[PDB]
Assembly symmetry: C5
Homo-oligomer: 164 residues x 5
């Protein structure tokens, strides 16, 4: 049923991890849903670029041969894959300011913790790294060693938020 005719999601070259990962996941998901072969998918790839990136594709066209190589090359030229110590310094710089919702803080911190190499941290030390930066509006009620998984922190945060 077609092969990359037209869609809303495009890519520009904004140089950030979130936009690049969102675009790659959306394209990779669309290919699986619509059911397009691997050889037919690479011919339609300049139908998505609209910016500086199409000038980037006019030069590096002869380096790609398969779909996975082109996707890894798009991940390599733009996502700079920052090292570990900048991430560990970026988590401890900004505390949770007053009058901010729990869910935005938790999803931003989880998206920041996903950048580390996989298999290096469990769930328990993951929650222990995040339990040291919350406001005293939430730390007065729920103590440590009672919340065992990463869902129960939000489950008890939404109760104190409604109570005020």
């Amino acid at each position: 049923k077609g092969s990359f005719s037209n869609c809303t999601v495009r890519f520009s070259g904004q140089r950030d991890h979130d936009a690049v990962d969102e675009f790659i996941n959306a394209v990779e998901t669309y290919k699986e849903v619509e059911g397009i072969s691997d050889k037919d998918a690479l011919k339609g790839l300049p139908l998505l670029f609209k910016s500086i990136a199409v000038v980037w594709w006019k030069g590096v066209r002869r380096d790609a041969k398969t779909w996975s190589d082109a996707l890894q090359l798009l991940r390599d030229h733009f996502s700079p894959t920052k090292p570990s110590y900048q991430i560990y310094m970026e988590i401890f710089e900004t505390k949770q300011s007053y009058d901010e919702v729990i869910d935005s803080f938790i999803c931003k911190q989880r998206a920041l913790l996903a950048k580390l190499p996989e298999g290096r941290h469990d769930e328990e030390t993951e929650l222990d790294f995040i339990y040291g930066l919350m406001q005293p509006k939430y730390r007065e009620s729920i103590p440590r060693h009672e919340v065992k998984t990463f869902r129960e922190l939000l489950d008890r945060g939404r109760t104190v938020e409604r109570t005020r």
Copy 2:
């Protein structure tokens, strides 16, 4: 005939009841009209998120297994389901100001009264809760005990509005 190819309605994370309920009802209605199966509908769900929420879906992907569970989880993480006393204080705070149409006031107050638990109020006390906040431009003509249902209030409000 396809399975969530592309559409105008998307979701961002605006943290309000009206936008979330509108998006969920529009998606739930589109699934019923187009005739898509339940197993095929969950594979196409990241084609709708475009914001912070796609970073939220990159983390909580392994918690969803059926369509109803994913819809209830999207209702739970964003719509905060406010308690009763804040609603009963929110209805009595703002009176109807001068030079405002009847229909906007009635639809906003009905959308505010839908947040209570279902089966707790009849139609008569529902109209009795709304008849105490209207302007004297409308309360001089129509008295109580004459309007029995919730349609006749608008039916007699549109007559006095045309008369001026």
Copy 3:
């Protein structure tokens, strides 16, 4: 061939006669062109609302049963169907200002004269009601009793406009 999948024309609740009549005529025309049945058309109606009006449709869903009833209810809740004397006062308030084209004035005045009940006025008194408000730039050349229909007024107005 589908049933209200996606289209550009939507409705918000702007509270005016022109936008409501345009939206209703465009939807009614699209249903006739595409060839959709009456029972299939009502299931897809919340795919068009995008505003306050979808909150209005979450409350008055159980009042509609057929397509004509829903269309008349959408005409009733928003188009206020103003009385006659306000129209007859609105026609005689604004004269035709200098340096304005004939066609805009004629189409606006015809759209204002359509609001009266049908069958109350002929063509001759219709032109007699409009011939008293034009500029002396046009009334110096063409006199009364020479223009018999409503087309010849524009036909002789476009000649004097080109001449200047």
Copy 4:
């Protein structure tokens, strides 16, 4: 394959020759490409108007019977078909200012010369009418009687432009 479902090009009523001629040519071209019959094309015409013009179509609906009559009526009510002496005064009013490209000047002047009645001028006097208003940056090099057609003027203008 459908009959005027939805498209980007619409019409508003901007009262100019270029926009009206572009819209009419695009619609006339789309009808020929998609292959739609003449009786099916007139039912879908209010799906394109979005402005004051739809109020204009609610009044003059009963005057159209064929496609050519409706197209000529749309050309008549909006394009005012200016007389000859205003065109001959409009060509000689604005000279070519300094630092402006040749191609924009030539295409604008050709679009202005198309408004005259057809068959009144050859190619030679057409170029003779345009050779009297160019800058001395171009008239120092190429003389008259050497450029015979209307293409060689641009062909020798692009050479002097690159040279500077």
Copy 5:
């Protein structure tokens, strides 16, 4: 499956090399992917122009007979194909300013070097022409004669960028 029905990419007449080359490559790629014949493709070409360029197409319609001739004519009337010495003066005018990423500089300089006639320069002198304008933030670490191809320059530039 259709023949140029509607798409996002259009052309206006912006008079620059990048936008024209992007539009031509996107159209040429879409024709190859969708599988349209050469005779059917030329009838649908005024469905893409939306600007001054459609007035340009109303005049030069009778000069095109095949697809390749129309594409070369669109490349000729707008892309001015600048001479060599302006390019060789444009490369050496702007050095790499401080706090700018390597990839943007490399892709812009490659897109500027593509304008020369093909077959005039190898890869080695191509890298030698670009190695004289970089910042001392990168020239302190990597010396000449160690980087042999044009990929290893970026491969060693991304390492020093992460290190800081």
